[PDB]
Design a protein around this ligand. Structure first.
Ligand code: Z99
Ligand code: Z99
Lengths: 770, 770
């Protein structure tokens, strides 16, 4: 209870003593902060251009790290609303703070009474909502803003799969929850595990915690939000359990820049990312400390306790009279707190709020106005969250709509080297991230920056199926096969005319194979074909020169001409059916087939007709010319109408071959000549064969006549069986893979065999010598 | 501020005066309740076996329907924690209530200090959660328990589609929200509309509200939760807008049992469901009122104001000395409040809590114990919610875990009749619903109970598709067609052999139609068939008797026998192919077909063979017997192997007919005799025909011989064309719907025509007279 005059009175709650009130002068926490508050008030009342003639007053009470004691004191604040009675004060703002769950309770009791309250040290995420704390402002970063630093650094280093660790308190739980929530929304990071310790661990607990963190050897980032016991005991109990070089630690101030947690556990904590609230050094207030005497500070009720506990003398034991002694040399090691700047900033913000309210409510009139006499709570709260000023550090102090303060942290890193063991500054976090990546050193099992990704980007051509529920993880599967590889998750089929590339991705044309001119199957047919076209040509040459000569007289008639033409055409098609297929070749092959088949058989039938039926015009010229021209014209028109013969149209078997291995699958350059087309084409040939067979069965009972007409029948009979053998060897070739090879060989050889039989008893031995 | 002695002191907040404090003695609200509290305390201190020698004290303060004034008074409660100074009191419980937002604020300031608070009149749903009101108990039903009555009655009457109405306040909004929430979870009810009025309506607002409630003429239940202005103005502004007999009203106490809202708007509110908190009548406290003098009630600070405002005399104007006058006769119309029972119940509950705590904390020792000297807040709160007692009504008072009280309401109904205009009691709601349905009267446009269902259950066979998002609504679609009707939403196809029932649901066998024996298409073939079997039989009779007779000598040989047999068989199959199909009939038809076709044609060929080729064994017996027996045995084995002839197997065309109308669709009893089977069956007949044609073309150049052999050829030629005509009229019948009819007629008539041609020049005119 400190009474300082004033015209606008404020209040102050401070943690003098410790956890009704136990006796331990908390010193740094309490006394320092009281002196800071009174100091800042003292320079507020001197600045001529801050609040004009208005003066400030102060009502400083005590809290002993208890919630209820602070409740009684906050009741003491509000007592002007309830014979030498003195006028009570009128508090227009409360400026006090401590560990949380104290600011919470005073915030409730003060929001019930529309009194603003600005805190300097209370940093609890639960105190970050307008509901239930509409009147609570804060001039220090929330601890939830610390969880935005770990997320940013984890994203910056590329880690997406981490393991969180915490302690059972209101600190660890809230910090881990904020880390999880920021990890959500903005994605890119995943949490493998979340292990929370108890307040008191049973024997072996740390071993189980370590081994369950060691269960998944892919998450090697441990974001610890937990007090010193976890640090010390996890880093020491991992020595003989051998997780060294397997976990990288990122911790909050609970670890901080301290060296006490690990006295020698340095090889288990060879790397760390530590976040600390920024710090300053107030010069005028240190002077205030240095100028405080005993005859001056009668303003402090509990200041003799400071004299007794800061030097060890019980004035009321060294029993020293204590004379007069400045508190630097005769005092023990001296240092101030880091939170004095915030308790100065709070009172400055409140004074600025009052000044800004004066600017509007009471214009021009120096001092006060009756309108301004009552300091309305709502207007003051509105003006408090409207200040953008800077003081006592050179750094700005401002509040968002919630009333919190922007967070300014710094980041330290821990490594070792010969003679070097320190906490280098790798950067900071003031509404953004600033990391000196090249400054970081992880020189224990990781030469470059370490890795914690759940899965690793694969080679192209291996479809990566993201496992459901965890984008940070996936599993790669080969997409080899006829299907092409399009995207990371997309690989669909490429067209059958595109063999999939041997590069495990891409597609290319299938090679096309064709019956080759030089092959171990076509050489013997072309050879026998040319052998035939030599001997047959020789005989034809013999006949024509000697048409009138006896014995060859029957040969002189054009019947022999037509038979020879048919034989030569058969041989020609035998040769041509071998060479490489082309756009129009096969149509020519078909026309030649029709032509030769008509010629030879028509000659055979007309000769048989002339020979036999005449036993009951007969002359060779008349009969032959008519029938030959007629039948040739018939087949000529049959060819002309392009029903059996195909157009230049062809087929390429790019993908018709169904080989499981694309590589060895091939194709053929096949004219689209159907087997039914072949059968119907030779149908007229079959009819001629049937007619000639009937005629020669009639001849079988041959009249005496001559002897040259029986070989005609015999040769035709042999050719009948020779050609009938073809049909089974036409149908049976479809089963084999080399359908084209066997089909072409059998057709060509069967034609050559029929031709050679016609070259037999028909006209060879009759002219052995002519 | 009232001071009453005591050893355990309680507190009381009451609404004396009205909305710093304006001067209007609120009377019924304040004074009555103060007297009730002091009365209940007076009988608490007399009961020998309630709290033993412990005595109670009282601290009664005032609230003037303001939140802040109550805040100051609640500060006054807690002042024992902060030279003739007197010892302040120690309140161990607060017993006070008012309209809400006052109990809320005192509950906050008291939960900060672990002081129990039991309310008697504060009924706000927001005060129904352990969070922020852990120390607030209630001895009156929440208004949220009223929203459980409307839901129950709406479910009981069958309504599932209603329209909610509200007023812009903390009453209407919360009530409608609770109604919606209870409408969810347990389903069965839907809300068509939710219209909320403003605090001040612009001109025409009510017209727009009425017309938007009138937009959907299917929801005719209006659950109003709104104060009197809505009642009066909506019921009066609907007169000329003609929504009478279109909305049924269910309202809360804001309407209540009052008659002031509608002075004459009775035909727009001819029916109502009103919910009211239950009521009692305290007898001892009315006596307390009657026994209060002026020289006694010095215990009340504000009691002269009651004397002045309850009679009109300013003692300090009738300026009457006021003598001594009891407050019944010389006083104006006297009546008490309904909430006195609750303020008695609160103090009784607190005293019982203290007694129960004494039972455990201090055993056996009468008076007090040092352990029991401090009345811990947590233990007292635990014991408060452990009481199951009854008093001051005969009804029980108890608290759930939340601290609320069970709700006991009654339900009134408003109707009119000649000379009757009242609020009958249709039942109540005490943790359940009790409705006298037969007591309700809606005798204005609804003789029976009215209806508000969004959709109406349809007839079976009409699939009801529930509209998504609203189970209470659906749309019925006919499911006529071959698909059967299974369930309300399920109607799938029934088997093709089951015509869907004409009952719009069900399936039944399709009638099967067959070629009938008496038909306008089969009569002429069967008639010509029997005509043939008469004349042919007559000729056969003639031949056999006269085999040796000349002219008939050629007929004597069994060649004529075989021809006659063939003709008779043809006629027989002509007859049989008409009658109804059966299991095995068609196989017999096929065998007879083969037999007759073989017989007739074989005879024709063998006769032709005997006649012609012999110009270059010849005797009738030898030749005929061999060939006839051989060919008949051939066809006999052909039949025996059941390849062409089908087994007893048959087909029924239950659903093969594809008629869009199932009703007229039919089926046929068809043997599975394929057309290819017919063609291949007659193939041997075709071969015989071809052979005979060749033979008779050879005969055409007939030798002189005789003249009976040329009709053989001529008749065969005619039969050739007659039978060849059948094939086009065999193939062309498939297009027509009556495929069976035309096919059977053409086959049978073609057979009869061929038979009649064989009955022509073969053997008829050669025996004109024998
Ligand atoms: N920021 C503090 C302390 C903060 C903390 C906050 C909430 C709960 C636990 C908790 O424990 C730790 C442990 C290590 C580092 C910081 C904290 C606050 O209580 O708000 C504030 C008391 C500190 C001060 O007054 O100097
Ligand atoms: N039940 C009351 C009143 C209830 C209500 C509750 C909440 C908000 C508004 C509100 O206004 C209406 C209007 C008409 C009927 C009942 C209420 C409570 O305040 O809880 C309480 C005042 C009653 C009393 O003190 O006798």
């Amino acid at each position: 209870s400190i009474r300082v005059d004033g015209d606008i009175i404020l209040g102050g709650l401070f943690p003098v003593h410790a956890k009704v009130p136990c006796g331990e002068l908390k010193k740094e926490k309490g006394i320092h902060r009281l002196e800071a508050m009174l100091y800042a008030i003292d320079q507020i009342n001197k600045d001529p251009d801050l609040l004009s003639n208005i003066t400030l007053g102060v009502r400083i009470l005590d809290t002993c790290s208890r919630d209820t004691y602070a409740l009684e004191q906050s009741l003491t604040f509000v007592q002007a609303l309830i014979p030498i009675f003195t006028k009570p004060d009128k508090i227009s703002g409360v400026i006090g703070a401590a560990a949380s769950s104290v600011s919470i309770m005073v915030a409730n009791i003060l929001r019930l009474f529309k009194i603003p309250q600005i805190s300097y040290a209370s940093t609890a995420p639960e105190l970050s909502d307008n509901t239930r704390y509409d009147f609570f402002s804060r001039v220090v970063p929330p601890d939830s803003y610390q969880a935005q630093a770990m997320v940013d650094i984890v994203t910056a280093l590329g880690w997406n799969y981490v393991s969180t660790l915490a302690s059972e308190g209101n600190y660890g739980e809230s910090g881990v929850e904020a880390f999880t929530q920021i990890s959500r929304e903005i994605g890119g990071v995943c949490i493998a595990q979340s292990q929370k310790i108890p307040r008191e661990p049973r024997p072996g607990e740390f071993e189980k915690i370590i081994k369950r963190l060691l269960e998944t050897p892919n998450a090697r980032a441990v974001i610890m939000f937990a007090n010193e016991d976890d640090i010390r005991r996890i880093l020491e109990a991992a020595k003989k359990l051998n997780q060294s070089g397997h976990f990288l630690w990122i911790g909050s101030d609970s670890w901080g820049s301290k060296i006490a947690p690990v006295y020698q556990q340095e090889e288990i904590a060879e790397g760390a990312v530590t976040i600390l609230p920024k710090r300053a050094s107030i010069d005028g207030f240190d002077r205030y400390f240095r100028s405080r005497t005993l005859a001056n500070n009668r303003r402090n009720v509990w200041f003799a306790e400071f004299w007794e506990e800061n030097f060890g003398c019980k004035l009321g034991s060294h029993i020293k009279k204590c004379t007069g002694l400045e508190r630097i040399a005769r005092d023990s090691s001296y240092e101030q707190e880091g939170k004095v700047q915030f308790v100065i900033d709070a009172v400055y913000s409140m004074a600025y709020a009052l000044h800004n309210m004066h600017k509007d409510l009471c214009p021009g009139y120096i001092g006060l106005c009756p309108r301004m006499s009552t300091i309305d709570g709502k207007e003051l709260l509105g003006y408090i969250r409207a200040v953008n000023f800077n003081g006592s550090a050179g750094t700005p102090v401002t509040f968002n709509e919630n009333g919190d303060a922007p967070g300014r942290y710094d980041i330290f890193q821990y490594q070792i080297t010969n003679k070097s063991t320190e906490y280098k500054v790798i950067g900071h976090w003031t509404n953004q991230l600033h990391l000196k990546v090249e400054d970081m050193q992880w020189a224990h099992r990781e030469h470059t920056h370490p890795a914690s990704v759940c899965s690793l980007p694969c080679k192209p051509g291996e479809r990566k199926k993201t496992v459901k529920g965890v984008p940070c993880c996936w599993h790669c599967e080969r997409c080899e096969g006829y299907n092409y590889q399009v995207d990371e998750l997309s690989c669909e089929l490429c067209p059958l005319d595109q063999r999939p590339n041997m590069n495990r991705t891409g597609c290319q044309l299938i090679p096309i194979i064709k019956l080759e001119w030089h092959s171990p199957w076509a050489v013997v047919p072309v050879f026998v074909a040319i052998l035939g076209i030599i001997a047959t040509t020789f005989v034809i040459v013999t006949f024509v020169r000697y048409n009138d000569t006896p014995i060859v007289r029957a040969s002189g008639r054009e019947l022999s001409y037509v038979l020879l033409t048919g034989i030569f055409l058969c041989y020609s098609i035998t040769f041509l059916m071998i060479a490489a297929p082309d756009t129009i070749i096969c149509s020519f092959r078909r026309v030649f087939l029709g032509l030769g088949m008509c010629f030879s058989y028509a000659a055979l039938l007309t000769k048989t007709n002339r020979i036999h039926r005449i036993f009951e015009k007969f002359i060779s010229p008349a009969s032959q010319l008519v029938i030959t021209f007629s039948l040739i014209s018939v087949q000529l028109l049959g060819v002309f109408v392009w029903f059996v013969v195909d157009p230049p149209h062809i087929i390429i078997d790019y993908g018709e071959q169904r080989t499981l291995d694309p590589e060895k699958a091939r194709g053929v350059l096949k004219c689209d000549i159907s087997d039914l087309s072949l059968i119907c084409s030779l149908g007229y040939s079959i009819l001629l064969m049937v007619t000639c067979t009937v005629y020669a069965i009639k001849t079988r009972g041959v009249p005496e006549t001559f002897n040259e007409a029986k070989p005609i029948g015999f040769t035709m009979y042999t050719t009948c069986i020779i050609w009938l053998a073809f049909i089974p060897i036409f149908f049976g070739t479809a089963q084999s893979a080399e359908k084209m090879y066997i089909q072409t060989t059998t057709l060509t050889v069967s034609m050559s065999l029929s031709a050679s039989v016609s070259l037999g008893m028909l006209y060879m031995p009759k002219v052995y010598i002519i």
